[PDB]
């Protein structure tokens, strides 16, 4: 659910 920059 943390897939990087957003």
């Amino acid at each position, epitope marked *: 659910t943390d*897939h*990087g*920059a*957003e």
Partner: antibody
Amino acid sequence: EVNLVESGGGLEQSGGSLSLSCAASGFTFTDYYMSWVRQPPGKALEWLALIRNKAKGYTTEYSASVKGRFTISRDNSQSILYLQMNALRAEDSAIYYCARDNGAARATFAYWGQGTLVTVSA
Amino acid sequence: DVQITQSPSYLAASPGETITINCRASKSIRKFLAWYREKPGKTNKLLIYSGSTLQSGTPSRFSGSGSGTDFTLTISRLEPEDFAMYYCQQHNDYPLTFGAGTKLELKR
């Protein structure tokens, strides 16, 4: 059936302004992050700008490399992404691509257009 | 900004063979590296994201791994459509930045 179609590229002189369009189809436009990335003839890919989805209030991010000269915006009813390019210079000559994220990693580019060629020259 | 160094810049291979590309970031990007394929006439294709996750439509013969600064892409059992240009891209922080590319050409 996702398609992204850039237009608006062509020849301009240094000093003026140009606006590019990207017509999006085949997906729910408002659900996705949209970006512009450019690639000059001989060079590297260069990310320029991103605009977030409705859930994030359509906020933006920009590469400081272009010194604020470009503005990204979206027409949500028409599913069109825009890049306004001010104070054009020869070094802006490149193919300009629009791109959409993959639905998970919001800063990746799952779908791209074929691009539009911008030429800044005398 | 995160500078990414992609190597080698050029590879030659044949169908059925395997190649590897490395990408090294100037500072940690956690696990957040993506890979793309570029080919004249086609739109760019996202292969892998978050270092090792396959994007839908990417065959299992693509393998990625790494964390922090050092990452790798390996394409095994190469097929004709794999002979193309490859780029890595960090997606940990803004500005989003790319490797300079690797040209995978067909041996003859």
